[PDB]
Design a protein around this ligand. Structure first.
Ligand code: HEM
Ligand code: HEM
Lengths: 103, 294
């Protein structure tokens, strides 16, 4: 997907809760740096609900589309108050941007 | 020789699925036009639209309300406190031309009910029967709350809408949606981090993080926190009055109770000043787009 517009989708839909630069300050959501390759519930100094650790699934770009389409449905009991990326293109735009700032 | 009484007449030849299609037409465009106002969606303005039209009611003489649907007149269209509500009206313009039978009151109220449900909020029972009215019934300006007041103004204003302390604190929890616009109202900044999803964060943010009354660039006082959130003078007075404070704690703790109480108060709000005959059907409970598999 597009790497330039995926940054815009992050700034408007994800920046208020998450940070991507290494050592980024935890907000309402976790710092999503280097999240690809590691599983779910990666505390590193953060408090998660047991629901996301309960679904110990490795974060590859395929299942995160399954997650960002409906966070409640993919993880019953999650804390992320997010509407969801209803368009597959917006999912491919946003995920490609994370594939750079979260390496 | 008598105060006005607004009888609900259901549109001829309409039932449940006839209005369920209208919900789906509204909820569908909330999916497509998801770019409005930096990817907030039309949800927040759609419920403020339903609020500002239903908030014009006056229980003393039963004027205004959602019944007449007189927002389509320029007299209510040019309200400074209704600045920015044109976008919620243009969102419903193509919907009303597709269904030329529905009344403006039923359409406006259905828009707010749709957005609350679609934004993961509580299911709000809805009723039909609102009827259009001429122009002489368009209420005058200044029938909506001023944002630059204290808790005494909040309690005395909502009594005009016949709502107790508990019912008014629940309605304020809808401010967790959307944001304030400078060129619209005179305040800037969002209320919370989940400005597109109906959540409990409103009461949480009030007590979680502190606030320091600062200046904005439009010469208005706003309570701003370090995390970027902001509130209004009338909104901040909720944690100054102890009786309103005893209710923000139960809302910030038992979220299910807040969803349960908001749907009661939001229905009563949209049904003010409307007397339904008993031959009218039971309140509808429309199904969200996820419940239909979309
Ligand atoms: C927006 C585009 C967005 C993305 C992308 C995103 C991703 C994301 C992931 C992959 C996780 C799981 C991390 C893990 O280690 O398991 C996660 C977790 C949380 N986030 Fe998030 N998230 C996006 C949006 C938002 C928004 C808008 C908020 C808050 C307003 C938010 C916050 C959270 C929270 C809370 C969690 C914890 C989930 C849990 O504990 O179950 N995110 N996010
Ligand atoms: C004393 C009470 C209230 C006052 C003074 C008030 C005032 C305001 C103001 C000034 C805005 C800014 C809109 C903009 O700048 O575009 C706003 C937005 C909003 N209001 Fe209210 N409001 C009150 C109560 C309510 C109630 C009862 C509800 C719902 C039941 C509600 C729901 C909303 C929502 C969702 C928004 C966001 C709209 C958007 O971002 O487009 N508010 N309100």
């Amino acid at each position: 997907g597009s790497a330039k517009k995926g940054a815009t989708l992050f700034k408007t839909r994800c920046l208020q809760c998450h940070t991507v630069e290494k050592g980024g300050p935890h907000k309402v959501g976790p710092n999503l740096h280097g999240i690809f390759g590691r599983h779910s519930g990666q505390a590193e100094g953060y408090s998660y609900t047991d629901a996301n650790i309960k679904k110990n699934v490795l974060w590859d770009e395929n299942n995160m589309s399954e997650y960002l389409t409906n966070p409640k449905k993919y993880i019953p009991g999650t804390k992320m108050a997010f509407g969801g990326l209803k368009k597959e293109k917006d999912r491919n735009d946003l995920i490609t941007y994370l594939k750079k700032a979260s390496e | 020789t008598t105060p006005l009484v607004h009888v609900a007449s259901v549109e001829k030849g309409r039932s449940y699925e006839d209005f369920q299609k209208v919900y789906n037409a509204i909820a569908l465009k909330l999916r497509e036009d998801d770019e409005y106002d930096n990817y907030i969606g039309y949800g927040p303005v759609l419920v403020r639209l339903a609020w500002h039209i239903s908030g014009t009611w006056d229980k003393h003489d039963n004027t205004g309300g959602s019944y007449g649907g007189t927002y389509r007149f320029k007299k209510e269209f040019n309200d400074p406190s209704n600045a920015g509500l044109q976008n919620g009206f243009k969102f419903l313009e193509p919907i009303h031309k597709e269904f030329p039978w529905i009344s403006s009151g039923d359409l406006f109220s259905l828009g707010g009910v749709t957005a609350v449900q679609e934004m993961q909020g509580p299911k709000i029972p809805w009723r039909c029967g609102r009827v259009d009215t001429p122009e002489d019934t368009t209420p005058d300006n200044g029938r909506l709350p001023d944002a630059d007041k204290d808790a005494g103004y909040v309690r005395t204003f909502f009594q005009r809408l016949n709502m107790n302390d508990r019912e008014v604190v629940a309605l304020m929890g809808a401010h967790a949606l959307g944001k304030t616009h400078l060129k619209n109202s005179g305040y800037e900044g969002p209320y919370g981090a989940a400005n597109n999803v109906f959540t409990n964060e409103f009461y949480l943010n009030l007590l979680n993080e502190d606030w320091k009354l600062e200046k904005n660039d439009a010469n208005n006082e706003q309570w701003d926190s370090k995390s970027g959130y902001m509130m209004e003078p009338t909104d901040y007075s909720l944690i100054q009055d102890p009786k309103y404070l005893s209710i923000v704690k139960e809302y910030a703790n038992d979220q299910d109770k807040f969803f349960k109480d908001f749907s009661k108060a939001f229905e009563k709000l949209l049904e003010n000043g409307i007397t339904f005959p008993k031959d009218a059907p039971s309140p509808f409970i429309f199904k969200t787009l996820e419940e239909q598999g979309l």
